[PDB]
Symmetry: C4
Subunit: 103 residues, 4 copies
């Protein structure tokens, strides 16, 4: 259906118009930076391969969770605690953003 | 008790009434496609029985998560990372939608 | 601080004013009903004690997840799939509700 | 690049500016209290080392979840059920707040 494509394209255009908003770019860079930091930390402190440090960082920051790995060191546990709250602060940031864009 | 039933039906209607919004429909289709790709990827790449691939696909895309399975290959891990962001993208889409539908 | 208590009490009052809203009561009954159904299903089909069937139902419907139990039967997996989407439909229901209450 | 920094600071300000809302403060305090009770309960009832009880408390209240630990006692299971709903109650509170702060 042509209607379907046109509607999708419009939506895709509206989505791309967000990656041009400064506040969104910030939130975006911040989560990327957060993901990098997590990758480094877990790779360093918990001794995970970079790929598994990124996976755990992603899965943790998004609340998906990992069914097998749990931080083994106390420093890792403390970091994960703060990491999770950064993630929540980030999502509220995006939520609030989407909220204001409805005004 | 009657009020409950009447409210339920009124709300239920509004829900099905939302299944009429073209943008909602696309979000929905996108989710199904996402779920199918996921099922295909995990069955193929991770060798999970089809039903187990849809399950992992569903619990992962919804952030529920699976307490026993985690992708075993680097290809799976990378795919899952992106898969998850697709899901978050889809949820914000629905939320943005619900937000717009509240304001007009 | 008296200010703190008064603010909390006001918030608590506003929260209780929700349990009087018909649409909220519905959403509330529905999730309770959903939790009951899950408890029954998992207790029956997956052979979990009622307490563990409720736990898994709660943890699943809220996206928290269980780090040890995963449905063992195909019927359980299919049910959990639909169960999760009911849960998401429920949360959007509450979200939409809170959204309209901001108007 | 300068715009980025200027936007970051403007946003950062608004965040700290929100740490001034009495209702936000209460939500925050409630969360900490919730996290402390949780830490106490799981250390006491489930016998988890304190730091492990705060961790489980945090990942559970945020729906992230723990892939290795699950409460072993019926008392823990029941408490966790309620703990989770408290967390959902708190999140809707914050969301309701963010919603009101957007409209005025
Ligand atoms: Ca596990
Ligand atoms: Na969530
Ligand atoms: Na999990
Ligand atoms: Na989870
Ligand atoms: Na989650």
């Amino acid at each position: 259906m042509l209607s379907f494509l046109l509607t999708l394209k419009r939506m895709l255009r509206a989505c791309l118009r967000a990656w041009k908003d400064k506040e969104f770019q910030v939130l975006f860079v911040l989560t990327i930076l957060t993901l990098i930091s997590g990758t480094i930390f877990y790779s360093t402190v918990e001794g995970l391969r970079p790929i598994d440090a990124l996976y755990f960082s992603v899965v943790t920051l998004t609340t998906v969770g990992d069914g097998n790995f749990s931080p083994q060191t106390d420093f890792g546990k403390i970091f994960t605690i703060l990491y999770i709250f950064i993630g929540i602060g980030l999502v509220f940031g995006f939520i609030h953003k989407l909220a204001v864009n409805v005004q």
